[PDB]
Amino acid sequence: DVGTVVGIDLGTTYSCVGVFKNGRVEIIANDQGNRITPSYVAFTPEGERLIGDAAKNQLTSNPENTVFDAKRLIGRTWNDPSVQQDIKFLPFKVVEKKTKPYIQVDIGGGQTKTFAPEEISAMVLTKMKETAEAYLGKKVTHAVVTVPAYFNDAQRQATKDAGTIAGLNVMRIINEPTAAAIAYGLDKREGEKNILVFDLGGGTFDVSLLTIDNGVFEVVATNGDTHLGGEDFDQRVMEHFIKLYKKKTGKDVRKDNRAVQKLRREVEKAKRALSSQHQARIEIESFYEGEDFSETLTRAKFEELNMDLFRSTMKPVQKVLEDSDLKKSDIDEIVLVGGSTRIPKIQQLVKEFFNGKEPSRGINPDEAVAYGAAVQAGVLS
């Protein structure tokens, strides 16, 4: 009845779909060649609804009508303090409607529409759903969707409604740090064990303490920083180079923002190379006023610029071990999740915190959560 069911990580900044096929989890690439999709939606002036890479790629020219970060609003009331903080930093319009924070956008030709956070995520889920169905050759109807461990009843439910709207029956909602633990099969051992998931993504940092008892996962304590992640590290290097531009050219870069978004691009690119290389080069043709940008970043400078931010990632790890009444000696597994955990300093930091103990390694940290979900989805047909 339920067909092939899909594992979906519906993430804040990125999304991932997986499937179980011929005895293996298959992570599916979208129509753009990508194993992760931006949780992005956009409406061009022509009236063309773009979701994914296509929406993320044109957000510079369409900042009002490019919806992102809906996970911050999903399952929340308009008057929720968190929401009233969040909407201050969000360049599309959020209105109070049916007690909720509805996204307001121009659909094309100045024509106005509002969308509940669940309707946006339903668009993102539809893209994951068409991403899966293109790989499989068939329609998909059922799914396993993940949420962060802190999500409450209303947030969990609204994620299921995003699902329903997308034409997806969400059979299971599983916690994100749990799906990760399942991806490493940590649920396939006898014992009582403690698991620390340290999840550092694009715009969020989450640390979960889990206990596993014979396939029974329990979340004991959670911590983190809802506004700390890879984008933050981008900003810091962006600041470094804007400040360097000034000092050499005398020119100031935030006068054209299209220059700023260009730098954003080549910074994020350089950072990523720097998890693998010791130096990277940032090259921009017609950066500002037609002039060409060309600079490099050492890994040492990268680390230097974010050292206080990297280091701050330990404090949640301590508050978690406190609230779980456990010392450092008690953690039996360390699971790294999120693309930012590829940063070498981050790893050095985790490892020496826990007195030299090596983390679980082997699964792509961007994919670990959709993987966990796809494993469970695999059981469900």
Ligand SMILES: Nc1ncnc2c1nc(NCc1ccc3ccccc3n1)n2[C@@H]1O[C@H](CO)[C@@H](O)[C@H]1O
């Ligand atoms: N190796 C890496 N090193 C440091 N940060 C990395 C990283 N890979 C990703 N992410 C995976 C990623 C993201 C975009 C990509 C684009 C082209 C090619 C590969 C890509 N890979 N991130 C950060 O994860 C956050 C959430 O993704 C973002 O802040 C991102 O910087």
